Design a protein around this ligand. Sequence first.
Ligand SMILES: OC[C@H]1O[C@H](OC[C@H]2O[C@H](O)[C@H](O)[C@@H](O)[C@@H]2O)[C@H](O)[C@@H](O)[C@@H]1O
Ligand SMILES: OC[C@H]1O[C@H](O)[C@H](O)[C@@H](O)[C@@H]1O
Ligand SMILES: [Ca+2]
Ligand code: NA
Length: 1038
Amino acid sequence: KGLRQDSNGKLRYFDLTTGIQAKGQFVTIGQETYYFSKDHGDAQLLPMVTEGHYGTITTAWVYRDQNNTILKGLQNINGTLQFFDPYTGEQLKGGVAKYDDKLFYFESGKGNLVSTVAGDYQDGHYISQDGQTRYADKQNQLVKGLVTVNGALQYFDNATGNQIKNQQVIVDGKTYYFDDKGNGEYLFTNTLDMSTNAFSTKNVAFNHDSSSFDHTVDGFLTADTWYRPKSILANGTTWRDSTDKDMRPLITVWWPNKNVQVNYLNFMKANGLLTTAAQYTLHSDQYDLNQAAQDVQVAIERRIASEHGTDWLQKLLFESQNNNPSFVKQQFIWNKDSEYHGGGDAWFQGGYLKYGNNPLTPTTNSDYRQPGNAFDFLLANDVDNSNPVVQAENLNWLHYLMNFGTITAGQDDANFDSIRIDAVDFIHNDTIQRTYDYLRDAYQVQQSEAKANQHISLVEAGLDAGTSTIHNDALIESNLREAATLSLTNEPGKNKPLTNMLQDVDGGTLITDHTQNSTENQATPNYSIIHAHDKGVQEKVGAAITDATGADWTNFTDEQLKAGLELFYKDQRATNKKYNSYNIPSIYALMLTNKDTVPRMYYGDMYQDDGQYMANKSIYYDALVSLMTARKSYVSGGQTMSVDNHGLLKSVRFGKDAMTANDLGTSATRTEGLGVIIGNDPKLQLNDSDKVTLDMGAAHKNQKYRAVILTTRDGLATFNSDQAPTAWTNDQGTLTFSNQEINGQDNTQIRGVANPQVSGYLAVWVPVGASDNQDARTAATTTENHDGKVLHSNAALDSNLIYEGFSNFQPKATTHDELTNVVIAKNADVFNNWGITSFEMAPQYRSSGDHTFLDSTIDNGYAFTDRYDLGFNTPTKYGTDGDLRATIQALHHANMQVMADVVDNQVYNLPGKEVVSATRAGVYGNDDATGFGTQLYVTNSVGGGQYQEKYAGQYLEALKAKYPDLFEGKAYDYWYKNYANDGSNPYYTLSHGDRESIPADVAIKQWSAKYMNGTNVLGNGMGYVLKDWHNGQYFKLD
Ligand SMILES: OC[C@H]1O[C@H](OC[C@H]2O[C@H](O)[C@H](O)[C@@H](O)[C@@H]2O)[C@H](O)[C@@H](O)[C@@H]1O
Ligand SMILES: OC[C@H]1O[C@H](O)[C@H](O)[C@@H](O)[C@@H]1O
Ligand SMILES: [Ca+2]
Ligand code: NA
């Protein structure tokens, strides 16, 4: 058998196991690779091409020889068969070429020849028939089997002609994947059958007990597994019964596919264990591959004897040799290539794996894992917030945070008062609804504005957070940030008109209208920002790093951050800004004077990260101080806003108790109210007769005004007392400006300017004569609410002001006194004096430090393992637990409430391993259609830490006794955002929820996969948990 000469001297081949003649295929025998004809089966020697190197031409691959000439057609290169266009010599990858008047497929990875294709079709058409898709050829006949259709590899079931979509399929000993559109790719070539010989039978496992195998997880075997065989070939010579000390690697005796087996033989050859000129390819006869593996095993046993051990073998197969990835990691099925990272729905970390169920994984299965919101995955280990036990644990943690001082040191003035729900749209609605009911039970926020306004909570979303807007349990983000991004933050010539600032609209739904706002309790309670720790900041700091160093987020060091931050602030301080927003003061002037919003100041707009906390003031500092100071003293009453014929935005507040322009107001009103004039065109010039007006209203006739902000040539002049330039209203309450100075006072004229602080125009005007302690704010009342809403947008809510008190890119403290939390406490009275009523602290959880995302590289507190560790023993980035308690006390003693950033979405760096069923998925929690399919997967899912062990579940029995309502099932409503098909505006419908009852007697002392929805991709591959790929059956120990 094998290669046999016929009666006319011609060569033919017969498969060494089956005896079938080779026709229309390639076969590697000895050192040589032959083709055998599809007609008579006549051999053809394909010359081995060694030397040369892979090339480029204008943009594709070729291969050039020893004499630098470009090779064409079929080529036998170092044990692979490749095809190069017969004219340009451009390498074919992922397609078919004709040879011997039939079709062969060359895979998309390396262009290797891997299989036969039945036909290639261009002229047929798809049909829908008996509930299926099929393909009919040019004679209207159904096409069957593995084919190409219009250049795409596809498969149609042989019996029916039904097209296969979203499945892995075995065709003639090769495994492919066909995506959601039926488009195909090669995965691997299968092994035929294992050596049934006496040698192989000695290699069978001693038994199926766990003591016979290692590197196992939950009873499953992995690529790293070593095992005890029945017998051992001691010394390379003598079969003996194995002992309990004999262990050998499973991948010396068994391979998941042919590609791995061939790669193994060649690797071993290259490292001394096989001496031969024989070539091992995908076209080698399986018999010869099986035999050569046995010869490798002989040589291993000889070396095990010489070395008195297996430590050399551990290294050879499983560790990086010469900077190269290990043998295991070189294989497709054991690396990230078989996980198909990325895609549009893979927002971070290369995308996600979603957990499912499997009969063999009872300890990781779940009856839950529904997203219950519009998004699901984002980062790291995604917490299943639909799970009843997890929802209880969320109440436990919330309780812990809201009583942190009481619990850790008996200090009742050192507890958080409100929350931020981080990544709200990525957690199940039941947990959000239940969280709001907790705040209701604990603080009676629903009773009146006086209770609600003591606990002003917020979420990271707009109107889409339907559980947050249905009863206005928390503030949503207004559309101001997005609107200002269109009309103010861009360079000259890239801003839209300011008419987009007149209404606050979220996908066509009105949040509040500024044009003529004389009402109260109409607007959706909201916060307005321009920047945040993660809104409009990273991307720009990243561009700065790159011009500065060459690095970016995927590779940057601590020195490179510092270098990037130097360039960042240098840019920020110039007129012409390569990376920074324009018109920041003007945007803050809008934020701080608009009616029906609670503004939130960002730390980073006031201070610079090229210094320690609060050390370096930003260029915008004086202007934002001046704006906060004037808001406290003057801003109350109604609003009007319009854009005039010169493009200038004119905004007026009338002052306390004046809702309209025609309101005569009361005696408090006369010295309150203000006027704001903004332009976004730095070349604005008025003619000599043009006027710009502010209609201050009927309470402000014949009245002197004074500047708070004026645009100057170089920047902005700021004034915090009545010693400033002045101007007078006429008998209707109108202020009138022009291109002339008023009474010779510099910077009172209207004109476009370009400087570091403004690109267009900014002025702010307040009535003269306020007392030194005038406070235009409105106190909350104890009056009972009757409309079902927790928060109401009115003068009292408008009187609050939030401070986001951190940045991602702040540096590490070098001393106690530099720690953020120690500096905050010391500066408490500064915040109170600015009118901050809510201090939003960073998340205080200890960072995982694992560098798998930005959060765990600059250690901001969003990426943690132990969510109860708030700086016990050694500090977080911001301080120790004792510092945190002192900060909360200091803020409370300066009349602020303090907000806890509650991060229910994920947990990082859980070192303990488990096995779970997994499929590729995106942020929406939709199954992606990838070659990974659905595989059992070794996840990093078990852990938590010392404070979770100490505190998780500890308060549940007492919470159930005090607020039993929280542990019951409950019916509820919420708004749901729908996207229209025809590209018109999203629209809101009312959804119904029914949360489940939850238990008080199961604690989550450590995370594990049964409490998780999934994980970011880990790079182990589609086949690191071992199975028989012929029938799909996992190896599992009993
Ligand atoms: O390194 C030799 C290599 O050169 C070409 O492929 C390069 C590169 O092409 C794709 O991006 C693949 O995904 C990579 O794995 C490849 O290394 C030839 O096409 C290939 O035949 C050869 O191995
Ligand atoms: O060309 C249009 C499409 O028609 C059918 O839906 C086929 O299943 C698909 O493979 C093809 O892409
Ligand atoms: Ca989630
Ligand atoms: Na509290």
